[PDB]
């Protein structure tokens, strides 16, 4: 799946790039410790998930 | 070369190792923000 | 007087010199003076 591999890999990059700016802003804003707890937790699993998905795809195109 | 799969990522791979130096510079942008208190 | 925070002008200015300097180091490898 030569195209479904890049779909996952750009997902990683676009998400990494989000969570790189997003986690530290989230953490030091006083407002929303609770409006954002879920956010980072979901991206987190989403990130890990993506690494795995991209990690297994590799072995069908590498 | 990287595996041809990851070829489109070549220019990002080009810039990545300079990233840790941006961290040092980011700390100074930060203290300028807080006025070197 | 003081409508733009000093730290912003600093970062901007800085990134501006980094570019010009970076360009001069590129020129050492390209074109005139590259030995090529």
């Amino acid at each position: 799946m030569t195209i479904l591999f890049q779909l996952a890999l750009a997902a990683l990059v676009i998400l990494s790039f989000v969570m790189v700016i997003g986690v530290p802003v989230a953490y030091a804003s006083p407002q929303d410790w609770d409006r954002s707890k879920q956010l980072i937790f979901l991206g987190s699993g989403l990130w890990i998930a993506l690494v795995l998905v991209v990690g297994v795809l590799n072995f069908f195109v590498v | 070369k990287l595996p041809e799969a990851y070829a489109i990522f070549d220019p990002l791979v080009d810039v990545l190792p300079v990233i840790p130096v941006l961290f040092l510079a980011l700390a100074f942008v930060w203290q300028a923000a807080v006025g070197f208190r | 007087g003081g409508r733009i925070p000093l730290w912003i002008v600093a970062t901007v200015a800085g990134m501006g010199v980094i570019v010009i300097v970076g360009l001069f180091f590129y020129g050492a490898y390209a074109g005139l003076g590259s030995s090529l």
Partner: peptide, 30 residues
């Protein structure tokens, strides 16, 4: 080509000053 690299570093490098910018707006805890 080299704009590929320059657009990446353009984007990566401005990533940093931005975090400072956002946390400032938000009267964040700098």
């Amino acid at each position: 080509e080299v704009i590929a690299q320059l657009t990446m570093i353009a984007m990566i490098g401005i990533a940093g000053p931005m975090i400072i910018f956002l946390l400032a707006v938000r009267r964040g805890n700098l």
